[PDB]
Amino acid sequence: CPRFLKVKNWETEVVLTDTLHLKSTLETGCTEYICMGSIMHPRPEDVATKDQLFPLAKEFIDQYYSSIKRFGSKAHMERLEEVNKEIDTTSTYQLKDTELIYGAKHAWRNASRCVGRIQWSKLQVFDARDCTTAHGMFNYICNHVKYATNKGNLRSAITIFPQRTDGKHDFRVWNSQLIRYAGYKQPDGSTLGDPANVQFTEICIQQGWKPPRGRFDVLPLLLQANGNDPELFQIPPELVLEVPIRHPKFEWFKDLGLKWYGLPAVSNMLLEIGGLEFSACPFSGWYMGTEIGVRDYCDNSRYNILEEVAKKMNLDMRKTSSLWKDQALVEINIAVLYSFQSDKVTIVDHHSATESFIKHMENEYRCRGGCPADWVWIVPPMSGSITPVFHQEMLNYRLTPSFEYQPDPWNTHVWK
Amino acid sequence: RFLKVKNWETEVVLTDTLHLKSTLETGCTEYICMGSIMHPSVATKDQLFPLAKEFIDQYYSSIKRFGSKAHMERLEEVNKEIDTTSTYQLKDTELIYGAKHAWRNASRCVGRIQWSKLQVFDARDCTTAHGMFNYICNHVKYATNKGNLRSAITIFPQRTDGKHDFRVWNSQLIRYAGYKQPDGSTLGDPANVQFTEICIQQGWKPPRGRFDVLPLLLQANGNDPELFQIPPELVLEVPIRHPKFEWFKDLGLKWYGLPAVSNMLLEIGGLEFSACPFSGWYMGTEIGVRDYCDNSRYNILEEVAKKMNLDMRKTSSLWKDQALVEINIAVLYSFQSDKVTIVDHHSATESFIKHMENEYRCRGGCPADWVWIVPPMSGSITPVFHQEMLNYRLTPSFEYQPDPWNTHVWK
Ligand code: HEM
Ligand code: HEM
Ligand SMILES: Cc1cc(N)nc2cc(-c3ccc4c(c3)CN(C)CCO4)ccc12
Ligand SMILES: Cc1cc(N)nc2cc(-c3ccc4c(c3)CN(C)CCO4)ccc12
Ligand SMILES: Cc1cc(N)nc2cc(-c3ccc4c(c3)CN(C)CCO4)ccc12
Ligand SMILES: Cc1cc(N)nc2cc(-c3ccc4c(c3)CN(C)CCO4)ccc12
Ligand SMILES: [Zn+2]
């Protein structure tokens, strides 16, 4: 590996120099002969053995004491010794509160696919490592939602449940986000509600949930403590801030009956710090408008929102070259942004977010020596080339602490 | 080993074995991916013969005559020719095969379902810039075809010692000049400001309009390049108007019909063709008229939004996005109305998915660069957005080469 790699911005001609990639610890999936940059992800018995844990913990503790300008100190050496004794005698170790907070913020700071990382150091960390039951998890999650929502002035936050021990006592949130709408596949094939959530909805109903069978039924929480079987809980509806979607010019848009929830809280990823694995760690921020997945709702039978909007706009839907899909996609995204701003719910448009990210990326190159960034996920899903990330070259690599994918729990769980 | 790629809308999984036959580096490593870097990075007798062999082998394998009589005879003939001349010459059949397969292997090209329909013009006998101009005129006339555009490539003599290169200095056969105004705005096409100044310094007398077709600057056998004017009756153009906004035509915009890329290098069996202009037809989003100045301060993007009376105070109004869609509607509407071949990004990406399926079935895979295949607008409502791809470098190939004015020893 060469010591300095350059990235160029082809609009501004600015060149940045990356050295931070020398600190990457996980494989990308690419090789010198093949690039897997567009692959989305390139057993339970296995937890870190003692001998695998030692070097990962040292690397994290070193990095932590380096960041607080205490590298090589008495404090640093005593912590190393203390961690090594814990691993020696218990096969694991416990993070200090300060290291837990540092590790969670840097897992976000290192998330190469996240365009909102300019915010990385303003993360509220909730330590739920004292949790023991699904009821306790529900309590912790309700407080998280209430704190993060903050009556529409959203605050990014993470709640960290106990780390993995032997792999048979994992804490898991089975939801993919804390707030999602149910989806119901009808006998004739059409979809009621959110088609993205049909499978998990079926699991909840299988587990005993009584579905209202509407378009916007907030799913229950499915929570697993200490490897036990997961248990169902209803989020108090007053904790779920929602926004009705309307359009600033099209009076008929509201008649589509659409709304969306304010808080994106992803809960099916894994947080890795110093070799420790926090398999339940829901984190939340606020939305970028393009993320809001209302366009895939069915309006009726075979017409989704995108098509219905085009019909109501009276666009020519016969030929594709009329760009009716593009026109309707813009109007939907205009409606989303206008509705959140009107109700004073935090949201960011893709122009502002990518513009902030470029400034963040420059600051990180200057102050940190690099900024891992996954162009394939950073560029927004519409109007790519008119955002400043499109012509920005990026280097992708995996730093630790990190957020990682993990198997869906229903595939791996051993039912009691 | 075998590698799988999933489409997350259709859940189709394809299995890639063809990447195993790749031997040029991508730029990535196990620890750093350079998928968004635009370019991450003469032949001796010893280097040449294995490359020539590999290509001859795959050629005779493709015509199902591997290990045949004529196959063995060709390897011996090529080997002897490298030994005595330090290079070798491709047969016409091989030249056509190689050119089509360089297109087939262009991982960044969404239009490759057409790869086998390519008219190849052998210009390896050319000796002078005048001859290059002749070959290029014939290429343009054939490819334009009164608006029924036909894909084509013209291939000039291969590199020898590196001091006698043939080069087309233009980036495309047809482009508009760009004039940086002391004002501060740009007259004409801002993307061509540098080459425009090189043409002026070379003696071109600029008309200083908005749509001045640049002269050809042609370099034969390493000599200094020479200027030529393409006959205007050969340059097919389309006035840009809008099917609903009658004021769009008042922006006075137009574009040329023939995209013909002339600054890339074609590599076949170890031989290097530094002058090989290739042309097809446009995808509507490629047409970079949005970056024109309408006045001394506002973009076509800004001018369109202004005439649509959009709110341009805040980005969240998405005025840029709205105007961008309307400019692309007009481009497509204008080419179709004038019966000039064009493809929209929905049809093109849809065709590319079908191309991938074909290629995985018959070839074992298809190298594809997601970063370049996804169109520059409305990405997620095209079928390629959710299509996983594998990117790898197969030869024959089209390659980047430095601008000739940074390497040329002037005399
Ligand atoms: C504060 C406002 C935030 C915004 C606007 C934002 C924006 C985004 C967007 C637009 C994506 C890609 C979405 C997609 O492709 O569908 C993303 C991905 C991601 N975000 Fe952020 N994010 C925010 C906060 C956070 C926080 C607080 C965390 C964690 C502490 C986080 C961690 C991640 C990760 C790990 C990914 C990649 C997920 C994956 O690989 O599957 N984000 N973010
Ligand atoms: C026939 C219709 C064709 C269409 C619609 C088409 C479309 C495109 C598009 C949209 C791009 C990317 C454009 C950009 O990023 O600005 C591209 C790239 C490319 N095209 Fe095609 N193309 C066509 C024909 C051809 C032909 C005939 C050749 C050569 C024989 C070719 C070779 C290439 C190459 C080499 C690239 C990548 C350039 C690079 O690596 O820098 N294309 N094509
Ligand atoms: C905190 C936060 C705020 C926000 N506005 N967007 C976010 C988007 C993601 C995200 C985006 C894509 C994605 C996944 C998560 C899940 N992985 C595991 C599957 C692949 O797809 C995560 C967190 C977000
Ligand atoms: C290559 C690539 C780049 C990028 N930026 N995002 C991607 C997102 C997905 C994705 C994954 C799961 C998913 C959906 C999208 C949404 N729909 C289709 C419902 C099913 O859930 C797949 C590939 C992506
Ligand atoms: C034949 C044909 C038809 C068509 N419709 N589009 C095309 C686009 C390209 C192309 C696209 C992008 C690009 C470059 C060329 C030049 N390289 C050297 C720098 C990187 O940028 C090439 C050929 C095309
Ligand atoms: C990462 C990436 C992906 C992609 N799909 N396309 C890209 C195109 C360029 C590009 C490079 C040079 C250039 C222009 C575009 C055109 N304008 C900006 C005039 C100046 O020349 C750079 C990066 C790209
Ligand atoms: Zn890569």
Numbering used by the authors:
A (entry chain A): 302 to 343, 349 to 722
B (entry chain B): 304 to 344, 353 to 722
From the paper:
Nitric oxide (NO) is an important signaling molecule critical in the cardiovascular, neuronal, and immune systems. The enzyme responsible for generating NO is nitric oxide synthase (NOS), a P450-like heme thiolate enzyme that oxidizes l-arginine to NO and L-citrulline. Humans and other mammals express three different NOS isoforms: endothelial NOS (eNOS), neuronal NOS (nNOS), and inducible NOS (iNOS). nNOS is an important therapeutic target since the overproduction of NO by nNOS in the brain is associated with a number of neurodegenerative diseases. Thus, nNOS is an attractive target for therapeutic intervention. In our efforts to develop inhibitors selective for neuronal nitric oxide synthase (nNOS) over endothelial nitric oxide synthase (eNOS), we found that nNOS can undergo conformational changes in response to inhibitor binding that does not readily occur in eNOS. Here, we used a combination of crystallography, mutagenesis, and computational methods to better understand the structural basis for these differences in NOS inhibitor binding.
